[PDB]
Design a protein around this ligand. Structure first.
Ligand code: FMN
Ligand code: FMN
Ligand code: FE
Ligand code: FE
Ligand code: O
Ligand code: O
Lengths: 400, 400
């Protein structure tokens, strides 16, 4: 274990190896950690657990810290596999230990573990749990941030906000605190996490933060369920979350596509040239969805004012990886972003129009599409380059 | 080179390494070959070329066989990259050599190579090209089998049908003829090819074969553009194509899904049990689309009377790999097949209904969906098992 502050002990698990989250839809290229906390005051309180893969390690490590029978309360901020996976193993040893969680958490905990006989205590925003020595826990409901059952737990005196998933990131490191790790890598993992997971709930982020700020609770540390404990200027990640939630965009355009004979790739590169020579302020990124990291593509979409998506026509429809990515973007609900579909075809085509419609269905404001037949010659490449110019002029944040 | 028959020389290229075709949408697990043929009678005729990766090897190997200036005619059955990729390199040495192809091939050849100054000769069904010694080429147009430009070339006397893509397969072997290779592996690669490439054009296969049969042309060998030369009972692959084109299905059900916490997987396995204990005649296959070979999944769909597709709800939509696969199936146009969508959800769900609709859009006859919340308990697994029973009864090819 590691001392977070005073009697707050980190009893979690580092994961140097993990690469796949949520099936294979989130790639953790820098590993992750599953943060669990044991508070030892007059009462002993366990906050969350860890991923099911480390269930036996978690309980054994917990035994080394404390007699399991001496644990008074268990707090479940969020009943996802990677935080509540070792719960069954733990409750098998101490089945009478009370669990404090939201009403929705009773449904999600019972939904996986199938042990409704456990002693649940529904908490709502403002509810308190005294743990002695003048300290108490204050619970804050945060539904759909990012699950119906989600909440945060605040510890008075020590002024530590146990935020669970919120403000966390998938970043594995031997050091626990934010000021002890690589700042660039930390930011990248934080932004990657928000972009790929929290984007659809951005409308809920600012009101909830505003609500919490109204509570006037001092914050010395933010202890999340993933990655570092924020202790040095801890509200920096809160400020980032406020920025990211406001339909975030930079002067940036992301271009991605799939291609069978590189015809659409040729179009994509020419489009990029047209943009770059029209608006020097715009940053451009290009990805082949079949050869690139999907989560990196989505992080760039999140960062972009607009996107261009390319596909050739394959059996009268679009290429499947493009269809898959557009479906996923539809779920993420990007806002105030623009889009244009492009691609090559052999005869009757149709995938470009089909893609433009689905981009619109995903919530993008659509500009005109760009089409070409077979491999673009010099004349066709000029048209693609002109398309990039036209797009750059239209999507300009400012004149010229 | 290798002697196919008499003065017909195989001047193609084996590809032991290739794993990706059409971007990454076709996995060639047993490599492939690109078959090109040089006929040396009174006239010298080159039939097709090879993939662009082996362009320099192709021309050099061709030089070792014949003075390039002595090549009289070039026949392009089909102007796809993997057959016309070395054409530019070749025509750079012999630019005056006439090219015989369909009208649509002029558009596809010029579409990639951008050399309209080449000497094209449009051929249509029944047209002939005398090459001396009492032998002639007879051309047969086969539009949308599988490209607009596609055709076949028949050589009289030797009775060899140069079928290009048709009846071919991605199977790399040192031996050239069908009777010299592993028969099981040959069948598997043949069926994999038809299922993943030719399925949407099945309605065109039987009429074209019937037309060709009416020509009463003797067939000693079928020399395709991929894999083996059919010399021993060569029409066996034609008979397979007739079977496969007739909305082919076996008493088989394919189940595939994606899952984040294995909840949908649990449903899939229970569904399979219900099927197996209801109808012993049905063969069942189960795939996780994120962990399986996509082309194998599609080959099984092709072989199946029906499918069940699983997804959990992810940000109010379906999992992207499932969305991608359903798009691809929409393009393949499977016929006379049934489907049922299933999956787990956390709260409001919606992906199962969404998937059922898109399966219907893909052309499947839909049965009722199966839904469950979080991880299925014993009661829920009984319902899933009952769903498999109900599906097995409904999709029964015969009573009981
Ligand atoms: C398997 C396959 C299916 C195709 N289906 C269509 C089609 O349905 N309609 C069409 O216009 N072109 C079709 N084409 C032609 C491609 O769209 C054309 O080659 C395009 O220029 C390739 O673009 P890309 O290199 O970006 O993949 C198909 C090509 C392949 C290889
Ligand atoms: C990233 C993520 C997003 C989710 N979005 C939804 C949703 O929008 N609606 C819903 O009902 N459940 C949602 N869920 C809950 C899952 O559908 C639920 O956990 C389901 O039982 C998982 O099924 P699986 O194990 O087959 O993936 C979401 C879960 C995750 C991890
Ligand atoms: Fe988490
Ligand atoms: Fe081919
Ligand atoms: O999580
Ligand atoms: O091909």
């Amino acid at each position: 274990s590691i001392v977070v502050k005073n009697n707050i002990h980190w009893v979690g698990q580092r994961d140097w190896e993990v690469r796949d989250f949520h099936g294979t839809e989130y790639k953790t290229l820098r590993g992750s950690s599953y943060n669990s906390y044991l508070i030892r005051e007059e009462k002993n309180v366990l906050i969350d657990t860890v991923d099911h893969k480390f269930s036996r390690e978690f309980v054994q490590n917990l035994r080394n810290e404390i007699d399991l029978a001496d644990i008074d309360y268990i707090v479940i901020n969020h009943a996802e596999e990677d935080h509540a996976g070792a719960l069954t193993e733990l409750m098998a040893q101490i089945p009478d230990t009370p669990i404090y969680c939201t009403a929705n958490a009773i449904d999600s905990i019972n939904g996986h573990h199938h042990h409704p006989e456990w002693n649940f205590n529904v908490v709502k925003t403002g509810d308190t749990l005294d743990i002695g020595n003048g300290k108490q826990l204050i619970f804050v409901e945060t539904p759909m941030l990012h699950w119906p059952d989600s909440m945060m737990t605040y510890l008075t005196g020590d002024a530590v906000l146990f935020s669970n998933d919120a403000f966390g990131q998938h970043y594995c490191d031997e050091h626990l605190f934010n000021d002890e790790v690589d700042q660039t890598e930390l930011f990248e993992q934080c932004q990657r996490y928000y972009a790929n997971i929290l984007t659809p709930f951005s409308r809920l982020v600012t009101p909830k933060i505003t609500e919490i700020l109204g509570f006037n609770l001092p914050v010395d540390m933010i202890a999340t369920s993933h990655g570092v404990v924020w202790r040095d200027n801890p509200t920096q990640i809160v400020e980032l979350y406020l920025k990211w939630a406001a339909d975030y965009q930079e002067d940036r355009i992301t271009i991605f596509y799939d291609t069978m004979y590189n015809n659409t790739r040729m179009m994509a590169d020419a489009i990029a040239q047209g943009i770059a020579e029209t608006d020097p302020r715009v940053a451009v990124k290009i990805f082949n969805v079949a050869r690139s990291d999907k989560n990196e593509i989505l992080t760039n979409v999140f960062r972009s004012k607009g996107v261009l998506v390319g596909t050739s026509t394959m059996n009268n429809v679009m290429m499947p990886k493009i269809a898959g990515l557009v479906e996923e973007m539809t779920g993420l609900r990007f806002r105030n972003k623009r889009a244009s579909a492009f691609g090559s075809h052999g005869w009757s085509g149709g995938a470009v129009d089909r893609l433009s419609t689905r981009l619109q269905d995903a919530g993008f404001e659509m500009s005109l599409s760009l089409k070409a037949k077979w491999r673009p010659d010099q004349d066709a490449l000029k048209l693609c380059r002109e398309h990039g110019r036209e797009i750059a002029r239209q999507w300009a944040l400012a004149p010229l």
